[PDB]
PDB file of all heavy atoms in Angstrom:
ATOM      1  N   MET C  13       1.272 -11.258  -2.758  1.00  0.00           N
ATOM      2  CA  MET C  13       1.361 -12.266  -3.657  1.00  0.00           C
ATOM      3  C   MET C  13       0.092 -13.092  -3.876  1.00  0.00           C
ATOM      4  O   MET C  13       0.035 -13.842  -4.814  1.00  0.00           O
ATOM      5  CB  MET C  13       2.529 -13.159  -3.276  1.00  0.00           C
ATOM      6  CG  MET C  13       3.771 -12.429  -2.896  1.00  0.00           C
ATOM      7  SD  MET C  13       5.093 -13.645  -2.837  1.00  0.00           S
ATOM      8  CE  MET C  13       4.232 -15.082  -2.209  1.00  0.00           C
ATOM      9  N   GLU C  14      -0.909 -12.963  -3.064  1.00  0.00           N
ATOM     10  CA  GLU C  14      -2.096 -13.786  -3.262  1.00  0.00           C
ATOM     11  C   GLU C  14      -2.823 -13.489  -4.632  1.00  0.00           C
ATOM     12  O   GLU C  14      -3.598 -14.325  -5.110  1.00  0.00           O
ATOM     13  CB  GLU C  14      -3.136 -13.502  -2.202  1.00  0.00           C
ATOM     14  CG  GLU C  14      -2.821 -13.662  -0.704  1.00  0.00           C
ATOM     15  CD  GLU C  14      -4.070 -13.166   0.193  1.00  0.00           C
ATOM     16  OE1 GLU C  14      -5.172 -12.702  -0.407  1.00  0.00           O
ATOM     17  OE2 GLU C  14      -4.011 -13.224   1.464  1.00  0.00           O
ATOM     18  N   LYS C  15      -2.682 -12.263  -5.167  1.00  0.00           N
ATOM     19  CA  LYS C  15      -3.298 -11.850  -6.401  1.00  0.00           C
ATOM     20  C   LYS C  15      -2.480 -12.427  -7.454  1.00  0.00           C
ATOM     21  O   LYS C  15      -1.432 -11.785  -7.891  1.00  0.00           O
ATOM     22  CB  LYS C  15      -3.135 -10.330  -6.572  1.00  0.00           C
ATOM     23  CG  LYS C  15      -3.948  -9.727  -7.723  1.00  0.00           C
ATOM     24  CD  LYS C  15      -3.186  -8.766  -8.377  1.00  0.00           C
ATOM     25  CE  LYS C  15      -3.972  -7.805  -9.139  1.00  0.00           C
ATOM     26  NZ  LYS C  15      -4.228  -6.837  -8.141  1.00  0.00           N
ATOM     27  N   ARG C  16      -2.905 -13.572  -7.999  1.00  0.00           N
ATOM     28  CA  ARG C  16      -2.086 -14.275  -8.979  1.00  0.00           C
ATOM     29  C   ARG C  16      -2.450 -13.892 -10.308  1.00  0.00           C
ATOM     30  O   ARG C  16      -1.641 -13.972 -11.225  1.00  0.00           O
ATOM     31  CB  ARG C  16      -2.371 -15.778  -8.927  1.00  0.00           C
ATOM     32  CG  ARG C  16      -2.369 -16.351  -7.572  1.00  0.00           C
ATOM     33  CD  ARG C  16      -1.110 -16.216  -7.036  1.00  0.00           C
ATOM     34  NE  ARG C  16      -0.264 -17.092  -7.841  1.00  0.00           N
ATOM     35  CZ  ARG C  16      -0.131 -18.429  -7.647  1.00  0.00           C
ATOM     36  NH1 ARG C  16      -0.808 -19.004  -6.655  1.00  0.00           N
ATOM     37  NH2 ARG C  16       0.704 -19.188  -8.435  1.00  0.00           N
ATOM     38  N   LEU C  17      -3.708 -13.539 -10.522  1.00  0.00           N
ATOM     39  CA  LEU C  17      -4.096 -13.229 -11.905  1.00  0.00           C
ATOM     40  C   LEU C  17      -4.079 -11.811 -12.040  1.00  0.00           C
ATOM     41  O   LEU C  17      -4.730 -11.162 -11.285  1.00  0.00           O
ATOM     42  CB  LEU C  17      -5.496 -13.752 -12.216  1.00  0.00           C
ATOM     43  CG  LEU C  17      -6.024 -13.168 -13.575  1.00  0.00           C
ATOM     44  CD1 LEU C  17      -5.174 -13.722 -14.699  1.00  0.00           C
ATOM     45  CD2 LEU C  17      -7.524 -13.541 -13.663  1.00  0.00           C
ATOM     46  N   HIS C  18      -3.249 -11.304 -12.938  1.00  0.00           N
ATOM     47  CA  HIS C  18      -3.187  -9.923 -13.206  1.00  0.00           C
ATOM     48  C   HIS C  18      -3.747  -9.738 -14.564  1.00  0.00           C
ATOM     49  O   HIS C  18      -3.032 -10.044 -15.665  1.00  0.00           O
ATOM     50  CB  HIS C  18      -1.704  -9.390 -13.176  1.00  0.00           C
ATOM     51  CG  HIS C  18      -1.121  -9.255 -11.795  1.00  0.00           C
ATOM     52  ND1 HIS C  18      -0.614  -8.058 -11.316  1.00  0.00           N
ATOM     53  CD2 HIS C  18      -0.986 -10.154 -10.776  1.00  0.00           C
ATOM     54  CE1 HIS C  18      -0.129  -8.238 -10.088  1.00  0.00           C
ATOM     55  NE2 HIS C  18      -0.364  -9.490  -9.728  1.00  0.00           N
ATOM     56  N   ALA C  19      -4.919  -9.185 -14.608  1.00  0.00           N
ATOM     57  CA  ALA C  19      -5.576  -8.953 -15.877  1.00  0.00           C
ATOM     58  C   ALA C  19      -5.455  -7.421 -16.119  1.00  0.00           C
ATOM     59  O   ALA C  19      -6.038  -6.700 -15.412  1.00  0.00           O
ATOM     60  CB  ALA C  19      -6.933  -9.346 -15.789  1.00  0.00           C
ATOM     61  N   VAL C  20      -4.738  -6.994 -17.173  1.00  0.00           N
ATOM     62  CA  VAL C  20      -4.451  -5.609 -17.523  1.00  0.00           C
ATOM     63  C   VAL C  20      -4.845  -5.182 -18.981  1.00  0.00           C
ATOM     64  O   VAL C  20      -4.660  -5.975 -19.916  1.00  0.00           O
ATOM     65  CB  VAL C  20      -2.903  -5.536 -17.495  1.00  0.00           C
ATOM     66  CG1 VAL C  20      -2.491  -4.425 -18.088  1.00  0.00           C
ATOM     67  CG2 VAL C  20      -2.481  -5.614 -16.123  1.00  0.00           C
ATOM     68  N   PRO C  21      -5.372  -3.927 -19.177  1.00  0.00           N
ATOM     69  CA  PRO C  21      -5.674  -3.474 -20.509  1.00  0.00           C
ATOM     70  C   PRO C  21      -4.358  -3.090 -21.166  1.00  0.00           C
ATOM     71  O   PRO C  21      -3.524  -2.693 -20.472  1.00  0.00           O
ATOM     72  CB  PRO C  21      -6.420  -2.142 -20.239  1.00  0.00           C
ATOM     73  CG  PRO C  21      -6.869  -2.142 -18.812  1.00  0.00           C
ATOM     74  CD  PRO C  21      -5.707  -2.882 -18.155  1.00  0.00           C
ATOM     75  N   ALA C  22      -4.126  -3.316 -22.467  1.00  0.00           N
ATOM     76  CA  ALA C  22      -2.836  -2.784 -23.164  1.00  0.00           C
ATOM     77  C   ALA C  22      -3.205  -1.337 -23.249  1.00  0.00           C
ATOM     78  O   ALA C  22      -4.410  -1.060 -23.221  1.00  0.00           O
ATOM     79  CB  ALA C  22      -2.836  -3.349 -24.680  1.00  0.00           C
ATOM     80  N   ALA C  23      -2.370  -0.349 -23.360  1.00  0.00           N
ATOM     81  CA  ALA C  23      -1.028  -0.266 -23.406  1.00  0.00           C
ATOM     82  C   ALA C  23      -0.565  -0.002 -21.913  1.00  0.00           C
ATOM     83  O   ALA C  23       0.425   0.654 -21.682  1.00  0.00           O
ATOM     84  CB  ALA C  23      -0.779   0.928 -24.154  1.00  0.00           C
ATOM     85  N   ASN C  24      -1.341  -0.425 -20.949  1.00  0.00           N
ATOM     86  CA  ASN C  24      -0.914  -0.226 -19.603  1.00  0.00           C
ATOM     87  C   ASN C  24       0.444  -0.922 -19.194  1.00  0.00           C
ATOM     88  O   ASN C  24       1.083  -1.712 -19.930  1.00  0.00           O
ATOM     89  CB  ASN C  24      -2.038  -0.660 -18.540  1.00  0.00           C
ATOM     90  CG  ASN C  24      -3.182   0.346 -18.438  1.00  0.00           C
ATOM     91  OD1 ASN C  24      -3.111   1.434 -19.024  1.00  0.00           O
ATOM     92  ND2 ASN C  24      -4.235  -0.003 -17.733  1.00  0.00           N
ATOM     93  N   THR C  25       0.768  -0.655 -17.958  1.00  0.00           N
ATOM     94  CA  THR C  25       1.935  -1.082 -17.319  1.00  0.00           C
ATOM     95  C   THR C  25       1.670  -2.064 -16.143  1.00  0.00           C
ATOM     96  O   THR C  25       0.731  -1.940 -15.461  1.00  0.00           O
ATOM     97  CB  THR C  25       2.499   0.104 -16.834  1.00  0.00           C
ATOM     98  OG1 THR C  25       3.537  -0.212 -15.892  1.00  0.00           O
ATOM     99  CG2 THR C  25       1.214   1.016 -16.230  1.00  0.00           C
ATOM    100  N   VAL C  26       2.582  -2.983 -15.888  1.00  0.00           N
ATOM    101  CA  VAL C  26       2.323  -4.013 -14.902  1.00  0.00           C
ATOM    102  C   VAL C  26       3.528  -4.198 -14.120  1.00  0.00           C
ATOM    103  O   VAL C  26       4.651  -4.094 -14.675  1.00  0.00           O
ATOM    104  CB  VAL C  26       2.003  -5.419 -15.690  1.00  0.00           C
ATOM    105  CG1 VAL C  26       3.193  -5.849 -16.492  1.00  0.00           C
ATOM    106  CG2 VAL C  26       1.501  -6.608 -14.747  1.00  0.00           C
ATOM    107  N   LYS C  27       3.336  -4.531 -12.850  1.00  0.00           N
ATOM    108  CA  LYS C  27       4.419  -4.751 -11.911  1.00  0.00           C
ATOM    109  C   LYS C  27       4.182  -5.985 -11.206  1.00  0.00           C
ATOM    110  O   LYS C  27       3.152  -6.185 -10.768  1.00  0.00           O
ATOM    111  CB  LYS C  27       4.374  -3.678 -10.832  1.00  0.00           C
ATOM    112  CG  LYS C  27       4.525  -2.270 -11.367  1.00  0.00           C
ATOM    113  CD  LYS C  27       4.406  -1.203 -10.198  1.00  0.00           C
ATOM    114  CE  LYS C  27       5.088   0.233 -10.601  1.00  0.00           C
ATOM    115  NZ  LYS C  27       4.393   0.978 -11.741  1.00  0.00           N
ATOM    116  N   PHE C  28       5.138  -6.864 -11.140  1.00  0.00           N
ATOM    117  CA  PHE C  28       4.961  -8.043 -10.326  1.00  0.00           C
ATOM    118  C   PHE C  28       5.978  -7.890  -9.201  1.00  0.00           C
ATOM    119  O   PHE C  28       7.110  -7.344  -9.429  1.00  0.00           O
ATOM    120  CB  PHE C  28       5.269  -9.323 -11.057  1.00  0.00           C
ATOM    121  CG  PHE C  28       4.390  -9.596 -12.255  1.00  0.00           C
ATOM    122  CD1 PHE C  28       4.926  -9.662 -13.537  1.00  0.00           C
ATOM    123  CD2 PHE C  28       3.043  -9.762 -12.128  1.00  0.00           C
ATOM    124  CE1 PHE C  28       4.138  -9.938 -14.604  1.00  0.00           C
ATOM    125  CE2 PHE C  28       2.262  -9.996 -13.286  1.00  0.00           C
ATOM    126  CZ  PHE C  28       2.821 -10.081 -14.464  1.00  0.00           C
ATOM    127  N   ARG C  29       5.641  -8.399  -8.014  1.00  0.00           N
ATOM    128  CA  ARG C  29       6.580  -8.343  -6.795  1.00  0.00           C
ATOM    129  C   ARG C  29       6.794  -9.717  -6.068  1.00  0.00           C
ATOM    130  O   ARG C  29       5.926 -10.580  -6.076  1.00  0.00           O
ATOM    131  CB  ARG C  29       6.099  -7.233  -5.790  1.00  0.00           C
ATOM    132  CG  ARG C  29       5.830  -5.879  -6.512  1.00  0.00           C
ATOM    133  CD  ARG C  29       5.300  -4.753  -5.677  1.00  0.00           C
ATOM    134  NE  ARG C  29       4.836  -3.624  -6.531  1.00  0.00           N
ATOM    135  CZ  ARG C  29       3.549  -3.351  -6.863  1.00  0.00           C
ATOM    136  NH1 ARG C  29       2.518  -4.064  -6.379  1.00  0.00           N
ATOM    137  NH2 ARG C  29       3.298  -2.320  -7.648  1.00  0.00           N
ATOM    138  N   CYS C  30       7.939  -9.939  -5.450  1.00  0.00           N
ATOM    139  CA  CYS C  30       8.080 -11.139  -4.590  1.00  0.00           C
ATOM    140  C   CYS C  30       8.996 -10.799  -3.502  1.00  0.00           C
ATOM    141  O   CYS C  30      10.133 -11.324  -3.419  1.00  0.00           O
ATOM    142  CB  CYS C  30       8.661 -12.201  -5.337  1.00  0.00           C
ATOM    143  SG  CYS C  30       7.533 -12.734  -6.728  1.00  0.00           S
ATOM    144  N   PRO C  31       8.612  -9.847  -2.685  1.00  0.00           N
ATOM    145  CA  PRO C  31       9.576  -9.452  -1.596  1.00  0.00           C
ATOM    146  C   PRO C  31       9.995 -10.653  -0.858  1.00  0.00           C
ATOM    147  O   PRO C  31       9.176 -11.401  -0.534  1.00  0.00           O
ATOM    148  CB  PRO C  31       8.759  -8.512  -0.743  1.00  0.00           C
ATOM    149  CG  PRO C  31       7.538  -8.104  -1.617  1.00  0.00           C
ATOM    150  CD  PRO C  31       7.374  -9.078  -2.711  1.00  0.00           C
ATOM    151  N   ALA C  32      11.280 -10.815  -0.580  1.00  0.00           N
ATOM    152  CA  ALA C  32      11.866 -12.037   0.085  1.00  0.00           C
ATOM    153  C   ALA C  32      12.893 -11.629   1.101  1.00  0.00           C
ATOM    154  O   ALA C  32      13.172 -10.473   1.201  1.00  0.00           O
ATOM    155  CB  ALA C  32      12.481 -12.799  -0.910  1.00  0.00           C
ATOM    156  N   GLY C  33      13.400 -12.592   1.894  1.00  0.00           N
ATOM    157  CA  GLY C  33      14.373 -12.398   2.898  1.00  0.00           C
ATOM    158  C   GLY C  33      15.305 -13.664   2.884  1.00  0.00           C
ATOM    159  O   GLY C  33      15.075 -14.658   2.082  1.00  0.00           O
ATOM    160  N   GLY C  34      16.316 -13.727   3.744  1.00  0.00           N
ATOM    161  CA  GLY C  34      17.223 -14.934   3.681  1.00  0.00           C
ATOM    162  C   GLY C  34      18.598 -14.469   4.025  1.00  0.00           C
ATOM    163  O   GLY C  34      18.900 -13.249   3.919  1.00  0.00           O
ATOM    164  N   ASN C  35      19.440 -15.393   4.459  1.00  0.00           N
ATOM    165  CA  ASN C  35      20.799 -15.043   4.880  1.00  0.00           C
ATOM    166  C   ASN C  35      21.765 -16.100   4.317  1.00  0.00           C
ATOM    167  O   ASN C  35      21.616 -17.309   4.617  1.00  0.00           O
ATOM    168  CB  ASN C  35      20.747 -15.115   6.328  1.00  0.00           C
ATOM    169  CG  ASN C  35      21.973 -14.516   7.032  1.00  0.00           C
ATOM    170  OD1 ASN C  35      23.083 -14.357   6.444  1.00  0.00           O
ATOM    171  ND2 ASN C  35      21.792 -14.206   8.360  1.00  0.00           N
ATOM    172  N   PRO C  36      22.629 -15.715   3.384  1.00  0.00           N
ATOM    173  CA  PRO C  36      22.849 -14.468   2.719  1.00  0.00           C
ATOM    174  C   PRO C  36      21.626 -14.059   1.912  1.00  0.00           C
ATOM    175  O   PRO C  36      20.873 -14.912   1.454  1.00  0.00           O
ATOM    176  CB  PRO C  36      23.932 -14.801   1.798  1.00  0.00           C
ATOM    177  CG  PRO C  36      23.964 -16.337   1.730  1.00  0.00           C
ATOM    178  CD  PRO C  36      23.593 -16.748   2.971  1.00  0.00           C
ATOM    179  N   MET C  37      21.440 -12.727   1.779  1.00  0.00           N
ATOM    180  CA  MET C  37      20.256 -12.072   1.071  1.00  0.00           C
ATOM    181  C   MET C  37      20.081 -12.841  -0.300  1.00  0.00           C
ATOM    182  O   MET C  37      21.067 -12.950  -1.141  1.00  0.00           O
ATOM    183  CB  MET C  37      20.846 -10.644   0.727  1.00  0.00           C
ATOM    184  CG  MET C  37      19.866  -9.429   0.960  1.00  0.00           C
ATOM    185  SD  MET C  37      18.126  -9.922   0.969  1.00  0.00           S
ATOM    186  CE  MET C  37      17.803 -10.081   2.982  1.00  0.00           C
TER     187      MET C  37
END
Side-chain angles (χ1 to χ4, degrees):
Chain C
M13 315 192 325
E14 303 175 0
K15 190 220 201 88
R16 312 297 293 277
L17 168 67
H18 285 237
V20 166
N24 285 352
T25 167
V26 62
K27 300 178 159 66
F28 298 117
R29 311 177 191 101
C30 296
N35 192 339
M37 222 338 97

